[PDB]
Design an enzyme around this catalytic site. Structure first.
Site, PDB file in Angstrom:
ATOM      1  N   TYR A  76       0.789  -1.223   0.000  1.00 23.07           N
ATOM      2  CA  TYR A  76       0.000   0.000   0.000  1.00 23.07           C
ATOM      3  C   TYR A  76       0.829   1.284   0.000  1.00 23.07           C
ATOM      4  CZ  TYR A  76      -3.563  -3.461   1.312  1.00 23.07           C
ATOM      5  OH  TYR A  76      -4.383  -4.576   1.395  1.00 23.07           O
ATOM      6  N   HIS A  86      -4.669  -9.684   6.719  1.00 18.56           N
ATOM      7  CA  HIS A  86      -3.372  -9.156   7.128  1.00 18.56           C
ATOM      8  C   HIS A  86      -2.958  -9.613   8.527  1.00 18.56           C
ATOM      9  CE1 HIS A  86      -2.700  -6.734   3.574  1.00 18.56           C
ATOM     10  NE2 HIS A  86      -3.901  -6.198   3.680  1.00 18.56           N
TER      11      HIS A  86
HETATM   12  N1  LIG Z   1      -3.927  -4.138  11.899  1.00 20.38           N
HETATM   13  C1  LIG Z   1      -4.651  -3.312  11.075  1.00 20.38           C
HETATM   14  N2  LIG Z   1      -5.423  -2.339  11.587  1.00 20.38           N
HETATM   15  C2  LIG Z   1      -6.133  -1.523  10.799  1.00 20.38           C
HETATM   16  N3  LIG Z   1      -6.107  -1.628   9.447  1.00 20.38           N
HETATM   17  C3  LIG Z   1      -5.350  -2.581   8.873  1.00 20.38           C
HETATM   18  C4  LIG Z   1      -4.608  -3.459   9.677  1.00 20.38           C
HETATM   19  N4  LIG Z   1      -3.949  -4.293   8.852  1.00 20.38           N
HETATM   20  C5  LIG Z   1      -4.256  -3.985   7.591  1.00 20.38           C
HETATM   21  N5  LIG Z   1      -5.100  -2.947   7.609  1.00 20.38           N
HETATM   22  C6  LIG Z   1      -5.735  -2.262   6.422  1.00 20.38           C
HETATM   23  O1  LIG Z   1      -6.608  -3.117   5.754  1.00 20.38           O
HETATM   24  C7  LIG Z   1      -6.847  -2.497   4.464  1.00 20.38           C
HETATM   25  C8  LIG Z   1      -7.019  -3.549   3.508  1.00 20.38           C
HETATM   26  S1  LIG Z   1      -7.506  -3.104   1.825  1.00 20.38           S
HETATM   27  C9  LIG Z   1      -9.307  -2.847   1.883  1.00 20.38           C
HETATM   28  C10 LIG Z   1      -9.706  -1.447   2.361  1.00 20.38           C
HETATM   29  C11 LIG Z   1     -11.259  -1.207   2.379  1.00 20.38           C
HETATM   30  N6  LIG Z   1     -11.907  -2.090   3.382  1.00 20.38           N
HETATM   31  C12 LIG Z   1     -11.896  -1.411   1.064  1.00 20.38           C
HETATM   32  O2  LIG Z   1     -12.681  -2.333   0.914  1.00 20.38           O
HETATM   33  O3  LIG Z   1     -11.567  -0.727   0.122  1.00 20.38           O
HETATM   34  C13 LIG Z   1      -5.635  -1.681   4.166  1.00 20.38           C
HETATM   35  O4  LIG Z   1      -6.015  -0.337   3.911  1.00 20.38           O
HETATM   36  C14 LIG Z   1      -4.772  -1.846   5.357  1.00 20.38           C
HETATM   37  O5  LIG Z   1      -4.030  -0.691   5.704  1.00 20.38           O
END
Ligand SMILES: Nc1ncnc2c1ncn2[C@@H]1O[C@H](CSCC[C@H](N)C(=O)O)[C@@H](O)[C@H]1O
Length: 256
Positions: free
Chosen positions: A9, A122
């Site tokens: 990202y 993630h």
């Molecule tokens: N521990 C965590 N806490 C908060 N956000 C997280 C995270 N780990 C990953 N993410 C976030 O999860 C997102 C996944 S991508 C999807 C983003 C959004 N829900 C949509 O549908 O467009 C990313 O922006 C990433 O930064």
């Protein structure tokens, strides 16, 4: 945080994803999928919603537009939150916050809906369980948990290409059934899991067609190298969803 911001990202990486998923989205199906996922959800102007992994804010924007609800998005990537903030103005019912959901604190019995779209992949397995325990506490007694996430066949069945994808992404992908069992172990009620891999495949195909028909525009905005990476990436997801190696899970549950 640093791993995500410097790799998957980066600013450009986010813009490439937005090109293919749709304005304000960086996950499967963009706006059209969001309309479908929320089709049977009831909220109103008094509802409080948490969006875990809120991204560029498309989901919060839609939920606030459709229901008038208070929406609070949390995302660990500060660059992405900054972008989300740039695209909403004059709306006191949409808030975005840069923070790790795993360390964030909220009052118990706070939210009518906790919502997450393709973000929990993630998290390590241990952290998925810890997160859902937090969500349980944070939901109102009458509240709902609504999730989509990348899932997969059992790890023993993964091929070299898929192993590499998961490793490079640092995803933790579990089966739809394992995921539902975590929710049950956290004492959520009325746990409904759906393997939406076929629908996901359809969404991927629409996106793939869009990418091909708008290749000239993509090349101008980005590069041929990035086009090839994106194109091949979608090609593999299409193949792997067709054969159920990579899956798309939907989960809905309640606190009571
Ligand atoms: N521990 C965590 N806490 C908060 N956000 C997280 C995270 N780990 C990953 N993410 C976030 O999860 C997102 C996944 S991508 C999807 C983003 C959004 N829900 C949509 O549908 O467009 C990313 O922006 C990433 O930064």
């Amino acid at each position: 945080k640093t791993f995500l911001e410097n790799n998957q990202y980066t600013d450009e990486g986010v813009k490439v994803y937005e090109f293919i998923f749709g304005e304000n989205y960086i996950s499967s199906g963009g706006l059209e999928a969001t309309k479908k996922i929320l089709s049977d959800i009831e909220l109103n102007e008094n509802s409080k919603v948490l969006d875990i992994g809120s991204g560029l804010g498309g989901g919060c924007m839609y939920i606030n537009e459709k229901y008038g609800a208070h929406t609070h998005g949390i995302d660990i990537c500060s660059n992405i939150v900054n972008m989300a903030n740039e695209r909403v103005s004059g709306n006191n019912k949409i808030i975005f916050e840069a923070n790790d959901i795993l360390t964030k604190e909220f009052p118990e019995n706070n939210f009518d809906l906790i919502y997450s779209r393709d973000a929990i992949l993630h998290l390590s397995l241990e952290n998925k369980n810890k997160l859902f325990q937090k969500c349980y506490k944070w939901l109102k007694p009458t509240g709902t948990l609504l999730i989509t996430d990348y899932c997969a066949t059992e790890k023993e069945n993964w091929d070299d290409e898929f192993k590499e994808y998961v490793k490079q992404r640092k995803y933790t992908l579990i089966t739809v059934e394992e995921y539902a069992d975590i929710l049950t172990a956290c004492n959520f009620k009325n746990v409904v899991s759906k393997d939406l891999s076929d629908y996901w495949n359809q969404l991927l195909e629409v996106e793939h067609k869009y990418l091909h028909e708008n290749k000239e525009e993509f090349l101008k905005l980005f590069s041929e190298k990035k086009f090839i990476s994106l194109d091949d990436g979608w090609s593999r997801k299409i193949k792997d969803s067709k054969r159920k190696m990579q899956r798309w899970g939907y989960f809905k549950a309640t606190k009571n």
